[PDB]
Amino acid sequence: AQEKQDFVQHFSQIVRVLTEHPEIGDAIARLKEVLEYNAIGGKYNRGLTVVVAFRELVEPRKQDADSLQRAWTVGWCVELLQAFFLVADDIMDSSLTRRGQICWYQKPGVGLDAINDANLLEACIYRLLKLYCREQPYYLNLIELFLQSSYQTEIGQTLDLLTAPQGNVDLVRFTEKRYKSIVKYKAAFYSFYLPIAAAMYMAGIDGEKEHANAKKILLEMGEFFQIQDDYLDLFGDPSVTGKIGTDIQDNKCSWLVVQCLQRATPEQYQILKENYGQKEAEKVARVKALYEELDLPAVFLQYEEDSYSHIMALIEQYAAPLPPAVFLGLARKI
Amino acid sequence: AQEKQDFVQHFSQIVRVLTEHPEIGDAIARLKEVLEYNAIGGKYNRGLTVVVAFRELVEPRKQDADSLQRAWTVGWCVELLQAFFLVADDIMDSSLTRRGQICWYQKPGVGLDAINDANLLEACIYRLLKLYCREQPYYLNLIELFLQSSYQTEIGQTLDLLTAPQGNVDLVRFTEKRYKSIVKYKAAFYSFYLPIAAAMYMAGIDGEKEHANAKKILLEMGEFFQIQDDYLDLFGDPSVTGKIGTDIQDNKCSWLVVQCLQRATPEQYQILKENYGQKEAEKVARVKALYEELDLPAVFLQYEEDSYSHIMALIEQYAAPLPPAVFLGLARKI
Numbered sequence: 281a282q283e284k285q286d287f288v289q290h291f292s293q294i295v296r297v298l299t300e301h302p303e304i305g306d307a308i309a310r311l312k313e314v315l316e317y318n319a320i321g322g323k324y325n326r327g328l329t330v331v332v333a334f335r336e337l338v339e340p341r342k343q344d345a346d347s348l349q350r351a352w353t354v355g356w357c358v359e360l361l362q363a364f365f366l367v368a369d370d371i372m373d374s375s376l377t378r379r380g381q382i383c384w385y386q387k388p389g390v391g392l393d394a395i396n397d398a399n400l401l402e403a404c405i406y407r408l409l410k411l412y413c414r415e416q417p418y419y420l421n422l423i424e425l426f427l428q429s430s431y432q433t434e435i436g437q438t439l440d441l442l443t444a445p446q447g448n449v450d451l452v453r454f455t456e457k458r459y460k461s462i463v464k465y466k467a468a469f470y471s472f473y474l475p476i477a478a479a480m481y482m483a484g485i486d487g488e489k490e491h492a493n494a495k496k497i498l499l500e501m502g503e504f505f506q507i508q509d510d511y512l513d514l515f516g517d518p519s520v521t522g523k524i525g526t527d528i529q530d531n532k533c534s535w536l537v538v539q540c541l542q543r544a545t546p547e548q549y550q551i552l553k554e555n556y557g558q559k560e561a562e563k564v565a566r567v568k569a570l571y572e573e574l575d576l577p578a579v580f581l582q583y584e585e586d587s588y589s590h591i592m593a594l595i596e597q598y599a600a601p602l603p604p605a606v607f608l609g610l611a612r613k614i
Numbered sequence: 615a616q617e618k619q620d621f622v623q624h625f626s627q628i629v630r631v632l633t634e635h636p637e638i639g640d641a642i643a644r645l646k647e648v649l650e651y652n653a654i655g656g657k658y659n660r661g662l663t664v665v666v667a668f669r670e671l672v673e674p675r676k677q678d679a680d681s682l683q684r685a686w687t688v689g690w691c692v693e694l695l696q697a698f699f700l701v702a703d704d705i706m707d708s709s710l711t712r713r714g715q716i717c718w719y720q721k722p723g724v725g726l727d728a729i730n731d732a733n734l735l736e737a738c739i740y741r742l743l744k745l746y747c748r749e750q751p752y753y754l755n756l757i758e759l760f761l762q763s764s765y766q767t768e769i770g771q772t773l774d775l776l777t778a779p780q781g782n783v784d785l786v787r788f789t790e791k792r793y794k795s796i797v798k799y800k801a802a803f804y805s806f807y808l809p810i811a812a813a814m815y816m817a818g819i820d821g822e823k824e825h826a827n828a829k830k831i832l833l834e835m836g837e838f839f840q841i842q843d844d845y846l847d848l849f850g851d852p853s854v855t856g857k858i859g860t861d862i863q864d865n866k867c868s869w870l871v872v873q874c875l876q877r878a879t880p881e882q883y884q885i886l887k888e889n890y891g892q893k894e895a896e897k898v899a900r901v902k903a904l905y906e907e908l909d910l911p912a913v914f915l916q917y918e919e920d921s922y923s924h925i926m927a928l929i930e931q932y933a934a935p936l937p938p939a940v941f942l943g944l945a946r947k948i
């Protein structure tokens with residue numbers, strides 16, 4: 281709440297910096313159009329964390345107006361990365377809405393031009409890092425952090441699509457081992473490691489063990505956030521979530537289907553086999569009815585309880601020498 | 615011819631390095647599938663230039679087997695970047711074939727999953743640079759070079775799509791000023807600056823003026839290569855080019871249409887207006903007939919002659935202190 285207006289208000293400086301070649305304005309005009317649609321209307325938790333962690337980890341006397349300017353910019357970089365993956369994930373998952381509005385590629389006049397928009401979002405990350413942090417000692421560390429988070433998330437997307445070929449029956453693919461691999465990579469997308477590591481490096485905290493300890497708390501959290509997202513795909517209210525679910529239709533290796541398969545009788549397996557991964561509303565309804573018969577909502581609620589206590593246990597073990605408050609603020613959103 | 619087998623043979627080491635987490639092999643297996651389709655069957659001019667320039671610019675006594683290993687790897691990085699842009703450009707331009715085979719996204723079982731494949735290609739650039747060149751003094755310079763070439767090409771793609779909205783008549787957009795902006799950015803894709811700069815940095819040649827001189831020769835060359843590509847879109851034999859042209863159908867600000875507009879009478883402008891940017895075979899035929907009536911092929915031949923002499927003139931002015939042979943080998947392909 282306290283850092284937001286100044287985070288959001290920086291957006292105008294972000295757009296100015298790239299724009300200032302009469303040519304290049306047009307492209308930044310479309311970037312501007314794309315961000316105003318695709319990185320405006322979110323809760324900005326990931327971006328804001330860079331600033332919130334900055335202020336926790338750098339002594340107030342070192343928090344001059346230029347270092348804040350760099351911190352706001354890096355938080356927005358985290359928001360650009362997220363938007364990059366989302367613009368493209370929605371095309372690939374054939375999604376309808378995000379954030380309560382029609383997905384960007386579904387907008388008339390956009391379509392598969394949204395492929396380039398996504399790539400432009402990603403390209404603008406590294407330009408802004410260059411323009412704001414190039415003379416800084418942590419510059420390479422931050423480039424490598426963004427590149428590595430992007431790699432991890434990308435491998436995740438690749439395993440997601442590979443396990444979910446359209447038009448095919450294979451629940452055999454949907455194993456607990458397979459899901460644990462996919463989620464490990466997808467968690468990189470949700471983990472607050474990227475913005476908390478960024479602020480750490482900006483604070484001059486670059487030790488490998490301290491990074492590995494934080495990464496470990498934050499990765500387990502990222503995994504919970506992906507399982508919650510899988511749950512909310514079907515059982516979430518779209519007016520709260522802002523998006524229509526597609527996992528059943530898309531033949532996805534969801535947490536829900538993996539839990540179903542572990543608890544299904546042979547006949548229940550046949551209902552799943554005949555109904556999963558198809559577009560017909562009445563077939564999706566059948567899968568949802570089965571999940572409810574198996575008490576999967578109750579199973580999720582219990583998993584959420586168990587997972588919260590574990591993350592808190594990891595914070596108690598792994599936070600030091602960082603302030604536990606770095607981790608606990610984010611955990612408050614579990 | 616002389617560096618190729620060892621460039622191509624390194625591909626196997628490239629795939630090994632990324633693969634060596636049982637998980638990650640699957641994703642590199644698909645990268646492998648994607649490259650074997652999408653970065654195998656080309657002339658490899660861009661990738662091979664890194665090596666050819668390496669050997670010209672580093673004294674033989676400094677050309678140990680590990681530095682060559684790094685050079686082969688960086689050349690392949692240039693090939694990954696090119697493939698990234700091509701995989702995505704073909705989806706966006708609704709293309710049918712490339713390199714004489716069906717475009718990757720047109721393959722049954724691929725489709726819009728090709729969006730992720732492209733992103734994976736790009737992600738693999740920076741991983742390989744990290745794995746091979748991380749301890750090297752030129753490491754940051756090379757990351758920034760790839761990031762900057764990618765930015766320039768991306769802005770180009772953005773201006774290309776913006777000037778060519780589907781379903782619309784506007785030849786008014788198709789001005790000589792507009793084309794000169796688009797091509798400046800698109801030239802980054804063709805310019806051999808990226809692989810020649812890479813070898814320069816690897817040779818410890820990092821002076822800004824020497825880079826700016828080379829960039830200037832190489833950019834004018836890149837512009838010619840884009841104009842040739844525009845020409846070949848319609849007047850090329852697909853069996854030589856490997857690809858079916860889509861520029862007329864796609865409503866593109868091509869060199870051909872810009873030259874047409876500069877030479878058309880008012881009635882010829884009406885034929886263009888009624889026929890450009892549409893899918894009907896008979897309408898495209900009408901535009902091609904008009905271009906021929908305006909002697910656009912002769913105009914291209916003369917432009918090619920004029921442009922070759924100019925590039926040679928820039929080499930004479932700007933090559934020193936690099937060996938002119940750096941530039942002349944590439945020019946041999948004009």
Ligand SMILES: O=P(O)(O)C1(P(=O)(O)O)C[C@@H]2CCCN[C@@H]2C1
Nearest residue numbers: 365366369370373466469506509
């Ligand atoms: O579509 P979302 O937002 O639910 C999804 P995913 O398609 O389920 O996997 C897209 C996001 C980016 C990649 C990792 N997962 C999150 C969640």
Ligand SMILES: O=P(O)(O)C1(P(=O)(O)O)C[C@@H]2CCCN[C@@H]2C1
Nearest residue numbers: 699700703704707800803840843
């Ligand atoms: O489709 P190509 O290969 O002709 C093309 P473009 O769509 O005409 O513009 C794609 C390439 C990458 C970007 C720059 N142009 C080259 C040429």
Ligand SMILES: [Mg+2]
Nearest residue numbers: 369370373375
């Ligand atoms: Mg999705």
Ligand SMILES: [Mg+2]
Nearest residue numbers: 369372373440
């Ligand atoms: Mg997805």
Ligand SMILES: [Mg+2]
Nearest residue numbers: 509510513527
């Ligand atoms: Mg989801």
Ligand SMILES: [Mg+2]
Nearest residue numbers: 703704707709
């Ligand atoms: Mg094309």
Ligand SMILES: [Mg+2]
Nearest residue numbers: 703706707774
């Ligand atoms: Mg194109």
Ligand SMILES: [Mg+2]
Nearest residue numbers: 843844847861
């Ligand atoms: Mg072309």
